[PDB]
Every structure is written in C-alpha cells, then in structure tokens.
Design a protein around this ligand. Sequence first.
Ligand SMILES: NC(=O)C1=CN([C@@H]2O[C@H](COP(=O)(O)OP(=O)(O)OC[C@H]3O[C@@H](n4cnc5c(N)ncnc54)[C@H](OP(=O)(O)O)[C@@H]3O)[C@@H](O)[C@H]2O)C=CC1
Ligand SMILES: CCc1nc(N)nc(N)c1C#CCc1cc(OC)ccc1OC
Length: 225
Amino acid sequence: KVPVVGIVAALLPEMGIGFQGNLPWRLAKEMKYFREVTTLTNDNSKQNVVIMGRKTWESIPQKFRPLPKRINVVVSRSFDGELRKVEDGIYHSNSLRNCLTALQSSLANENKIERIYIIGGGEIYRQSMDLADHWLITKIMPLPETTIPQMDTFLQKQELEQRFYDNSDKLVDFLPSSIQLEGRLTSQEWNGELVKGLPVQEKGYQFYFTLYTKKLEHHHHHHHH
Ligand SMILES: NC(=O)C1=CN([C@@H]2O[C@H](COP(=O)(O)OP(=O)(O)OC[C@H]3O[C@@H](n4cnc5c(N)ncnc54)[C@H](OP(=O)(O)O)[C@@H]3O)[C@@H](O)[C@H]2O)C=CC1
Ligand SMILES: CCc1nc(N)nc(N)c1C#CCc1cc(OC)ccc1OC
C-alpha cells in the first residue's frame, strides 16, 4: 500500500554510482534534492522511511546518521530478524524483502509512513528492481572539459529499462508539493540517449532529476480463493 521508490544519482551512460565505498562526486545541490525529497511529505503527520544496505550506512558521515526526520532502516544478513528497533531513528533488518513486508503492515505502521525510499547501495538496488514502484534517478553527465570519475558500482540500466519507462513529465507532480526545483522540464540528447527531466549544473557536471515508473502489465492471473 505505501509506494516504494528507489532514489539514486547515477553518471551516464553506464549509470555509475560509487567507487571504493564512496560516491564519485560531491554535489551539494544533488544532496539537497535527495534530502528534501526523502524528508518532505504531503501529510505533515507522516514520515518517510529510508532503507539502505549496511555498506551505504557505514559510508554516511557519523555526524549525519541516522538521517534526520526519516525512519532509517539498515539491512545486513548478520542482523537478527525482519525489523528490530536498535536505537532512536534506527531499525535493523536481516532482509530487504521481509522489512518491506513489515513496513507495509498498517497495524505496525499506523498508516503514518508516506513513502518508503530505497537509498542504496549497488547490491540493494540490484534486488530492488522487482520491488520498487518508481525510481527517482538523478542523471549526471560530465560537462565537456570534465574528467569522467573512476567508478566500480553501477545501477542495472538493462533491468531498469525492461521494467520501467521514463515518466519525467510527471516528476514535478510526483515530488512532495513543497519542494521547489530550479530547472524547467528539458529533453536533451546526450551520447545518443534522450535525457529528460529538470536540469541543474554544479561544479563540472550537468544533471537532470528524472522519474521512472513501472510499465503497464498484462493481466495474466489474479489469485482467487
Ligand atoms: N550514487 C548514489 O545515489 C549512491 C551510491 N551508493 C554507493 O554504493 C556503494 C555501496 O554499494 P554496495 O557496496 O553494493 O553496498 P550496499 O550499500 O548495497 O550494502 C550491501 C550490504 O547490504 C547487506 N544486504 C544486501 N542485500 C541484503 C538483503 N536482501 N537483506 C539483508 N541484507 C542485505 C549485506 O550486508 P552484510 O555484509 O552486513 O551482510 C551487504 O554486504 C558505495 O560506493 C556507495 O557510495 C550508495 C547510495 C547512493
Ligand atoms: C548522494 C545523495 C543521494 N542522491 C540520490 N539521488 N540518491 C541517493 N540514494 C543518495 C544517497 C545517499 C546516502 C548518503 C547520505 C549522505 O550524507 C547525508 C552521505 C552518503 C550517502 O550515501 C553514499
């Protein structure tokens, strides 16, 4: 019942997202977007959840975690079970899939979660293509004089574009209504792919905020008792 949204920043065209356990760039406007999207809600009585893998959590600066004003969930196979409060703001789960089931329980959640955002890292996003309802992808491109950074972790773009379509016409309506974005919706070709979304530039990069949404599915079966 709650939407599940993966949110990630990726460098085109290979959709690289990390190198040596860290992000391959430091873009304050891209961090601000991620902060505002995952923190803000349309209903001020609700919060969103951020779910992340153990190596993502260990990479977030200590003074900045758990991420404020969001319920944080960290997943590790060494943890005890599907969704356990361990500290204020912090839940631990030994299962991405079972934590999503647990968070979706209206009895547990009192209908006070608005969205669940899956915020990384590579291993977790690999497993999320069949769990997410939408992806919010910041597509990053180096500007012509900018050196492409080294990267070692990538979003699965094949499986992205099998299952989801570029729905960026609807991004501004999908984001919580109090966010305010600088760009207007723009379509630009870049190395032969269409990049569509809300543009910004920072340091040596241009990047677009984009929305992908699941493709329509045929009706093959519905379970009957
Ligand atoms: N550009 C961006 O938007 C982002 C980039 N990143 C980048 O991604 C990289 C980190 O990715 P990665 O190394 O893949 O690691 P992850 O952050 O994906 O963490 C992987 C760990 O999560 C646990 N885990 C994985 N699947 C499950 C599951 N189904 N259930 C319970 N636990 C599970 C395991 O923990 P354990 O070993 O303890 O069992 C595993 O080692 C860094 O470079 C980081 O900067 C991260 C977030 C955002
Ligand atoms: C890097 C900011 C970001 N952007 C988008 N679009 N999606 C995301 N999932 C993230 C992220 C993240 C986690 C994070 C937070 C942080 O300081 C608050 C530092 C590092 C982070 O992840 C490696």
